[PDB]
Amino acid sequence: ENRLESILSRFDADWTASDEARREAKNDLFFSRVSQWDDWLSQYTTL
Amino acid sequence: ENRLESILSRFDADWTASDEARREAKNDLFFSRVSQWDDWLSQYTTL
Amino acid sequence: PEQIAGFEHMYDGNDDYPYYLLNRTDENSGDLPTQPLAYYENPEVPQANA
Amino acid sequence: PEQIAGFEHMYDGNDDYPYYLLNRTDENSGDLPTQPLAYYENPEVPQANA
Amino acid sequence: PEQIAGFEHMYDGNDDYPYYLLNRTDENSGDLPTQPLAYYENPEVPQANA
Amino acid sequence: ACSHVIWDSNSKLMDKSDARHCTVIHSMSQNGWEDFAEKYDLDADDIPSF
Amino acid sequence: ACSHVIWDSNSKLMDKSDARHCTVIHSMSQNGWEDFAEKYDLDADDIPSF
Amino acid sequence: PVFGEWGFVEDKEVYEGVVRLTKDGQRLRNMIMSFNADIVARTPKKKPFFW
Amino acid sequence: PVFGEWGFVEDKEVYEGVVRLTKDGQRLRNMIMSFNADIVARTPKKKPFFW
Amino acid sequence: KGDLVRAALRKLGVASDATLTDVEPQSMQDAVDDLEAMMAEWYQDGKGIITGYVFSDDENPPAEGDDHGLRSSAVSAVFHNLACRIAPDYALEATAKIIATAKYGKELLYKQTAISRAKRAPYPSRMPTGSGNSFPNLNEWHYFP
Amino acid sequence: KGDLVRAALRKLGVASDATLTDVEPQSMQDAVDDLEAMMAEWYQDGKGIITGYVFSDDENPPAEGDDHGLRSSAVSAVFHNLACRIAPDYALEATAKIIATAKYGKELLYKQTAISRAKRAPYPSRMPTGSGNSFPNLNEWHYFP
């Protein structure tokens, strides 16, 4: 379609690309954790 | 905002930065202990 | 059949239950379900063959 | 079922309790809950197969 | 429950006491608290799996 | 980089040279944003998002 | 390549040099299709299939 | 951009470092290890039973 | 400033020396060790029971 | 005479029946109460044996000809066990076949319940999530869900 | 005649009942006191068996027709055990089925309590805090909390 609204173009190319900076990124930044932060995940107060 | 109160500026840039000299510093100075002071922590009089 | 009867359900291969049940009693006696001490011996390949 | 009955709660997988309980008595007799001496034998892979 | 009853206090994990106590007697019989000979068998990882 | 530089331009190779976007993201402290709005000349009272 | 280049021309050898087809397939993002329809000059509002 | 192991799958970009494969077993190690620590900590010591 | 292992995570600065990883196991060592010392210290020696 | 054993009456009627005797004064109360007690030792306020037995209303109506509401499968058990309990009232040892059938019956009451109460506990507080398991949800194991 | 067993009377009434006898002088006191004693050996000032039994007021009212306040599930037990205790008063060995039901009942009284009294003790004075556990609070283990 035609919609030369600049931000709608740029934003609607990031949004579209952040659907891959999802499936993978989700994992990738998660490794920067089992090593960088700590090897346990998602509770943070147990007994 | 505008608030050229000098100390309010300098102090409100330390305060802001000591929120990292927290999460990390907390750990970091704590290692200077399991080695430097003693490997036990937070009781100091048990039987 | 009598000792397992009622819950043969539990012996098929489920890791669903926390244990195995056995019938204890039986009108006309006090059942002797000496906890199942008997399994069919494993295949062995005779010493002679070996 | 009778010996565990009342506290099958304790046998599911909790490390919540300090021990396991068993029913001792039963009207119509003195129950024989000979502490659970019987477990289902482990899978083995027959010598022959090996 | 009967044999431990009275001092289940002592079986929780304290290294406070010098020993463990058990109830000996029971009106309506001479209790049979054959010193606790029965523990739940340890997890094993079957030979077959191994 | 896994979560800041993002460039699915359908780029089909490792140096992402066939890409045409490569949108990167900055996270910055208050003082950093003030100094950033300084450099690139922007309304320091705007406060961005992503 | 296992699922994109496909060329059974009954090609009987490894470099597929005796082939006569070799139909390949492209999967591409919306922006990629627009840029593709740009290059090869096509109706960007068509939207292909395979 | 630098990449470790990189490639495509379902026409989806894919990549990983050394760490990813280890995660599963390493967690088991930590868990079992922690379990054992419990075993040593909370658990009655050997003492006699008396009437 | 000198740094050992250094980097960023959640856009949060991060760093550590050799010591940090060892802490967990080393405490266990000390504990179990102390427990054992108790075992040796406070604990009835082998003697006979008589009426 | 009467047919199906539907009233808490019949329990006691046929309880006495299975012993040997056949007498009926007000002693049917002094023995129905024996039954209500029993059917309350069993079924420890819902943690015991489930039978579908219905109790006095906490309204004064504590007994007699009102329904028991037991399952058909439970009857030959409650009234056999009843027999044993009230036999000492009439200076009587219940015959062997009875104590046997009572012992047998009481187990069967709990059988289907015991199977229901099996239930495996969930994965522990810890326990890794597992790479094979897709859709992370709660990392590790829920332990509560 | 009377219905539900609500008075400490009824305990003794039906205690004697379950033995064989049916006599009532002042001996109902000499036997209610036997009961109050029992229900005080049990329930060692709260460390024993919990029954909900209500005692003499420390006001002179030490017995008779006043309520017992037992749970419904506890009755068939207290009065069976009562029977055994007072039977020697009347030169009498309690029948087998009774001693059996008393033995059985007394266990059940304590069952739900025993489960309550299980309880695992907390982590020891020592015991590391654990790196996996976030928010330090008290380092190592609380051992008191």
Q: Distance between CA atoms of A44 and A41, rounded to whole angstroms?
A: 7
Using alpha carbons only, give the angle J81, J86, J90 rounded to the nearest 5 degrees: 145
- Calculate the alpha carbon distances from B41 to H36, H44, I23 in Å: 22, 25, 12
The experimental method behind these coordinates is X-ray
Residues J106 and A20: their CA atoms lie apart, in Å, by 63
- Cα–Cα dist G30/A3, whole Å: 14
Kindly determine whether residue A24 and residue H27, on different chains, have CB atoms separated by under 8 Å. no
The verdict on a CB contact (< 8 Å) between D12 and J119 is yes
- Give the C-alpha separation, F20 to F7, whole Å: 8
B43:K129 CB<8 A:
no
Q: Is there a contact between G7 and G22 (Cβ–Cβ < 8 Å)?
A: yes
- In K3-141, the DSSP E strands lie at none
What's the resolution in A?
3.3
**Among E44, E45, E48, E50, CA closest to D47:** E48
Sequence-distant (6+) residues with CB within 8 A of J122 are D13, J141, J142, J143, J144, J145
Scan for tokens 């840029």, then name that residue.
Answer: G35
Task: For residue K40, give the 3-state DSSP assignment.
Answer: helix
CA-wise closest residue to F19 among E44, G31, J70: G31
Residue E10 is encoded by which pair of tokens?
A: 């002592």
Which of chain F's residues have a Cβ under 8 Å away from the Cβ of G26?
none
Distance CA K19, CA J88 (A): 7
Locate the chain K residue with the closest alpha carbon to A38: K132
SS (H, E, C) I19-34: HHHHHHHHHHHHHHHH
Reduce the secondary structure of chain B to three states and give it as a string: CCCCCHHHHHHHHHHHHCCHHHHHHHHHHHHHHHCCCCCCCCCCCCC
Whole-angstrom Cα Rg for chain D: 16
DSSP secondary structure letters along C1-50: -TTTTT-GGGGSS-S-SSS------BTTB-----TT---PPPP---TTT-
| CA distance linking residue K9 with residue J141, whole number of Å | 56
Q: Which two tokens stand for residue J35?
A: 């039954």
Contacts of D47 (CB under 8 A, 6+ apart): C42, C43, C44, C45
Chain C interface with J: residues with Cβ < 8 Å: 6-7, 9-10, 15-19, 21, 23-30
Q: Which of E27, K89, K3, D2 is nearest to J34 (CA)?
A: K3
Q: Which residues of A touch G31 (CB under 8 A)?
A: 13, 16
**In chain G, which residues have their Cβ closer than 8 Å to the Cβ of A17?**
29
Contact yes or no for D23/J133 (Cβ under 8 A): no
C42–D47 CB contact, under 8 Å: yes
Q: C45 near D48, Cβ under 8 Å?
A: yes
Question: Quick check: helix, strand or coil at residue H49?
Answer: strand
In order of D46, J32, J77, J81, J114, the CA distances from J109 in angstroms are 41, 20, 8, 12, 9
- Residues recorded for chain K: 145
Give the SS3 label for residue J86: helix
Give contacts of A31 with chain H, Cβ < 8 Å.
Answer: 16-17, 19-20, 23
Strands E20-21 and H13-16: unpaired
Q: Is K142 on the interface with A (CB under 8 A)?
A: no
Q: Closest by alpha carbon to D14, among J107, C26, K30, J122?
A: J122
Q: Please, are residues K123 and K141 in contact by the beta-carbon 8 Å criterion?
A: yes
What the block records as the tokens of G15 is 């470099």
Asked if K134 has any chain J CB less than 8 Å from its own CB, the reply is no
Strand partners, C20: none
CA–CA gap between residue K32 and residue E46 (Å, rounded):
60
Report yes or no: J105 and C4 within 8 Å, Cβ to Cβ: no
Contact call for residues E37 and E16 (beta carbons, < 8 A): no
C-beta separation of J12 from J31 below 8 A: yes
Residues of chain C in contact with residue J97, where contact means CB-CB under 8 angstroms, are 27
CA B7 to chain centre: 21
Which residues in chain G are immediately followed by a break of C to N over 2.5 Å?
none
Whole-angstrom CA distances from A3 to A6, A17, K38 are 8, 19, 91
Alpha helices in J1-145 (DSSP H): 8-19, 29-41, 72-86, 96-116
